Design a protein around this ligand. Structure first.
Ligand SMILES: NC(=O)c1ccc[n+]([C@@H]2O[C@H](COP(=O)([O-])OP(=O)(O)OC[C@H]3O[C@@H](n4cnc5c(N)ncnc54)[C@H](O)[C@@H]3O)[C@@H](O)[C@H]2O)c1
Ligand SMILES: NC(=O)c1ccc[n+]([C@@H]2O[C@H](COP(=O)([O-])OP(=O)(O)OC[C@H]3O[C@@H](n4cnc5c(N)ncnc54)[C@H](O)[C@@H]3O)[C@@H](O)[C@H]2O)c1
Ligand SMILES: NC(=O)c1ccc[n+]([C@@H]2O[C@H](COP(=O)([O-])OP(=O)(O)OC[C@H]3O[C@@H](n4cnc5c(N)ncnc54)[C@H](O)[C@@H]3O)[C@@H](O)[C@H]2O)c1
Ligand SMILES: NC(=O)c1ccc[n+]([C@@H]2O[C@H](COP(=O)([O-])OP(=O)(O)OC[C@H]3O[C@@H](n4cnc5c(N)ncnc54)[C@H](O)[C@@H]3O)[C@@H](O)[C@H]2O)c1
Ligand SMILES: [Zn+2]
Ligand SMILES: [Zn+2]
Ligand SMILES: [Zn+2]
Ligand SMILES: [Zn+2]
Ligand SMILES: [Zn+2]
Ligand SMILES: [Zn+2]
Ligand SMILES: [Zn+2]
Ligand SMILES: [Zn+2]
Lengths: 347, 347, 347, 347
């Protein structure tokens, strides 16, 4: 059944030309498993991977995409817990070494041999892609794969962020950039986890979408000038935890000021070489923690997909065929991502 | 017995002239209690208070000192748990409002009405000083008050820092500035708490004193150039938690790079208007937390004084009379603090 | 304005006769504050206090009630943070010594000098009652005092329990006794905190009320025989955290078996001298934690009253006059508490 | 080099006769790896496995032993992170499914498909034994394998226990049964982690050995009658965390009474069908947590072996040949284990 060739967009030279062609099927190593990828999201990480600008060297030739979702067609002889026909998800972190120290502690994303899907491994921009049998996401049966694709890297990231913010149910969380592709999932996850969301975003239709997905207070970062004072006024003391999913370094810097004392400031957005210069005196006096957060581990994956299965979170996807993926990249690096451009592999 | 006047160094105008004179005894408010201060430490915080440069306005006239230790002579009618003749310690945070939200959570140092001793309240540079009956430190009987004076603001600070670093016994902690007045207490507390200390300091005799108080690995920040690589080599991956007690902003910036992934970087030293510009990408990818830490709360006070009572920590004090306190300040802002200039009130 | 006498139900001899009479006003000690109690709840704790059967000796003569809510008429000279006319709540733990070790750590309810309201202090069954200025609850203005009365000991208890269960949003919590006076508030707080509630109760109308206040799965402990298997079937592995608000020791014992491995079993209900004999082998192998939980501290008080202010939790109170309080006790020790018999002080 | 047969003690029928004979070499599955076991400890768990009395059915025929340590001779094709000639340790939990929910969270010991070494898998009582490449312990090179054998199940267990006790450096920990084979390692680990050890044991030479390995206070459970009062007197309020490594159910019951309020009581010893009947009222009022603790996970393994590598913990082993293993079992079920009967495989 597995066709000896599949369709996919691959590129050989970094920042080169996305060639939609046919490629042999990756065979599943004894530990890996093959996935007939049905849909796949796209995010800034795929741009950075195709650029090659990030410090780690991208394994070329490379088929991109780290937010893939599909059905298992063939597993490795060593695999257990998986069955054929199951719904699996190729996350960003493809496979870790399961033998260092971070792999053991749970933070698998920092393994010095972290095989990154779509960066150092065949990504999720093909009809069939291989992925580690342990790190793959157990997408529950019957789920709408196209709808769940963005949750696999975006939703998991914001969920691990919120868990890293050290918030208690009823506290104030400020999603700096709540209308964005990450911000909307962050707001939904925060409202589901019991926090009180305070979005900070601006532009056209942003506040409307934010009210739609459910948010207590909205702060337009274009109309309101003193954002810090506005947040301190709304939350009455500062947000108990901020999530910097925005891309403006200025917004990150301003985030370390409207966070309540003893609060937390999760850094998630990774703008182009920015610095989080917080006033060391103001940070010490108020004991403000500025935590970073990479893609979540397996437990976070399971819990985020659980939150999705209960219909709590929703992603306004825009299904698009795979053949036009180069045009998708072109509009992406120009900033045309409106909701979330989930790609379709069959098309 | 309480003399209607006591000796003390007071100053009326910020950055003015330290007048050693006689002052009426502060009467203990129903909640406060009076303390015949026997000894008192000095630290950069007292310099900043006498300057007035810090944002909060210093209550003038002001008798300085926030690291005082003495014997209770008279308590307020409302006070309970205290007895006359007990050994009490005037910490930095004199009295909080015990009715807001941070006071309740335990982080009393952030109360918007935090009465700061020696900054907004009569400090510990007098024969007799009043202090809150709740925040005062319960110095155990028989303790050498002169020896315990530095533990009251320095030791408590580094202990709350180490507790904030989220380390487990056996991890690697890098005390950036281990030979300093804060660094030595930090190293002793870390070794007592089970961590593996890695000091980062330099100068004359620093490494010798560091080996004396007990430290695994020392890194001279003047001879060694690539500090980051050196720490990564010694700790084999990065220190599980860094404590930035140094005053060089450059050292703080370099600290966010030799901290192990998923580690922590407690900011304690408050240099003159510095910025902790950490590479947001490197901080996110490795999930490095940069936590701040102010003076510890009451529980930290009790635990740190307990560590001192078991003879685990030691402070190389230099007892000096109170009369020469202006000269002490003069040599201090010139940088003549060698070990820790603990002052004597009687002298 | 303060009348030199007020109405109240007092009793002199333990398990004696509840005399509704007039009593002089308690004067507020410099640390305490007076409260014109407007309403007050009742719970099994008041029965146990009136019996005197509990080990601690009840201060006689004693006016009962530990769930009082009223308006501040006069505060002590030492009090700060409070204003006249504010809405305050007399919780169970009236005043702690704020000088021992548990008081410092936050667990004030275990202070060896814990002044227990209605047990060792003048309770909340009078028109005017005094209460500690620190431990009193800051009931927000405009709140319906009669509605908030049960939240002051019941709601706070179940909230501290759920926080002690160590659950993450999306986990399974089994409120053993969900329909009871404590169980309903527990279910509401759990649903608000993001958990997935699984009630275990039975009787008449219980499941209907449980569906009303919002609960995923209900297990009738009278119709269903194998409760353990039923819970394991519903939660698919065991509830991530159980809350034993029931009074049947058998139910507590059965609770240590349907809790998921690595889960938790908060003990809250205090039946008449029961034992939690859990199979030590089964508890070890599955690493099941059986945590206890007394009344919450000040932070829990603030957070629970916050959850109430957002209209998330609701208590089906039954306002009853104070004059009939003896009949209330009589019907109580016979088991006639239907919803929650909140008493009215004016009536 | 791998001999087609090796020596080993195997038994076919539960509670049967230990036959020392020759057995074919287990071949390493693609995920497993073979280990030329050099030494191996023995503990009550091996008795229970040979009995078959434990609920899980023991895979027969079965070679016992779960505390093995040896050198890797041949790894599976899929294995990464391991090299030939490395020092590996066969712990109790041989291999988990790494695909359920507990495996993901880190608590691998509760996987419903937890392959238990020496219970459901070929144990460590043979010259060569296979073990999972992930769960195997990375014994550092040059370590004295005979000395490290007991640390592989005993030391890891007590370390995970102490970590589960939720203690802070400087607190009081009561090792109920400090002189025993588990108690001695517990005391050493506690002293290394910074806690203040208070042993509770009795018999001949017990207190002497306890003073030897380093313990603050010792309580003879045979001479002293009121153990609870004695511990409350020594620790001044109750031990902040108790570790019930003893086998007397009476001692476990007595443990839930001398634990300080808000403390913890780790259950580790698994006596023959015992019950931890704690007074539910006393447990609630003091909020005493009774946590269980099975064998630690991989992170605990690494940290415990690290504590061993720094020479902090030591096990008084008694090297004995493998041929006499049946006599070892016979003396064991009669209670002749004096220190720790580490077996030698070559002999
Ligand atoms: N850490 C991870 O694992 C991970 C994974 C995926 C994406 N990311 C990061 O997510 C970001 C992209 O998120 P997205 O898809 O929502 O991007 P987007 O560009 O689609 O949306 C960004 C949002 O930021 C808002 N914004 C812009 N300037 C702002 C300001 N000054 N203050 C507040 N909000 C402001 C915009 O209005 C918009 O709502 C990138 O930084 C990317 O690297 C991180
Ligand atoms: N947060 C608080 O509650 C609190 C309280 C008291 C003091 N402090 C802070 O403590 C600091 C003073 O500490 P101290 O008394 O030890 O000061 P100190 O000047 O006596 O010693 C500072 C130490 O830093 C070392 N150092 C200098 N440059 C360094 C570099 N580049 N890298 C590493 N180490 C370097 C020095 O050699 C010395 O050992 C100040 O920042 C002060 O504000 C904070
Ligand atoms: N720890 C504290 O701070 C604190 C404070 C207040 C009350 N409490 C405890 O709360 C309890 C009273 O709660 P309440 O007011 O809801 O009591 P209640 O008697 O009004 O209700 C008890 C509930 O338990 C249910 N139940 C009975 N048998 C059961 C069984 N076998 N399994 C499951 N559920 C069963 C009943 O149907 C009912 O829903 C008492 O134990 C009291 O001491 C504790
Ligand atoms: N949970 C796990 O992963 C795990 C692993 C291995 C062993 N264990 C358990 O460890 C226990 C064996 O430990 P050991 O090897 O030290 O056993 P042992 O029999 O060699 O020593 C037991 C100790 O308990 C002491 N003791 C006896 N009665 C006591 C009492 N009333 N109060 C206090 N102390 C008392 C004895 O004097 C002795 O010091 C068994 O329960 C076993 O199942 C658990
Ligand atoms: Zn790894
Ligand atoms: Zn993504
Ligand atoms: Zn306050
Ligand atoms: Zn100081
Ligand atoms: Zn107290
Ligand atoms: Zn109550
Ligand atoms: Zn599993
Ligand atoms: Zn063992």
């Amino acid at each position: 059944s597995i066709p000896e060739t599949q369709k996919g967009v691959i590129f050989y030279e970094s920042h080169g030309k996305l060639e939609y062609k046919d490629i042999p099927v990756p065979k599943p190593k004894a530990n890996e498993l093959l996935i007939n990828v049905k849909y796949s999201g796209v995010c800034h990480t795929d741009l950075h991977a195709w650029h090659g600008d990030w410090p780690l060297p991208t394994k070329l030739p490379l088929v991109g995409g780290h937010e893939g979702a599909g059905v298992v067609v063939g597993m490795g002889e060593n695999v257990k817990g998986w069955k054929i026909g199951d719904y699996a998800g190729i996350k960003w972190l493809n496979g870790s070494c399961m033998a260092c120290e971070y792999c053991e502690l749970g933070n698998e994303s920092n393994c010095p041999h972290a095989d990154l899907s779509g960066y150092t491994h065949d990504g999720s921009f093909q009809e069939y892609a291989t992925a580690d049998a342990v790190q793959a996401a157990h997408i529950p049966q019957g789920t709408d794969l196209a709808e769940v694709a963005p949750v696999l890297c975006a939703g998991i990231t914001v969920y691990k962020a919120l868990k890293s913010a050290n918030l208690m149910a009823g506290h104030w969380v400020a999603i700096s950039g709540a209308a964005g592709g990450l911000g909307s999932l962050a707001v939904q996850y925060a409202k589901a986890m019991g926090y009180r969301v305070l979005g900070i975003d601006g532009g056209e239709g942003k506040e409307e979408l934010f009210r739609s997905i459910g948010g207590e207070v909205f702060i337009d970062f274009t109309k309101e000038k003193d954002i810090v004072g506005a947040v301190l006024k709304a939350t009455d003391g500062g947000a108990h935890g901020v999530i910097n999913v925005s891309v403006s370094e200025a917004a990150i810097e301003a985030s370390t000021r409207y966070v309540r004392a003893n609060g937390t400031t999760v850094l998630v957005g990774m703008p182009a070489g920015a610095k989080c210069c917080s006033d060391v005196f103001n940070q010490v006096v108020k004991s403000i923690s500025i935590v970073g957060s990479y893609v979540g581990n397996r437990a976070d994956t399971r819990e985020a997909l659980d939150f999705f299965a209960r219909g709590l979170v929703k992603s306004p996807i825009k299904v698009v065929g795979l053949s036009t993926l180069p045009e998708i990249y072109e509009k992406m690096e120009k900033g045309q991502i409106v909701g979330r451009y989930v790609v379709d592999t069959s098309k």
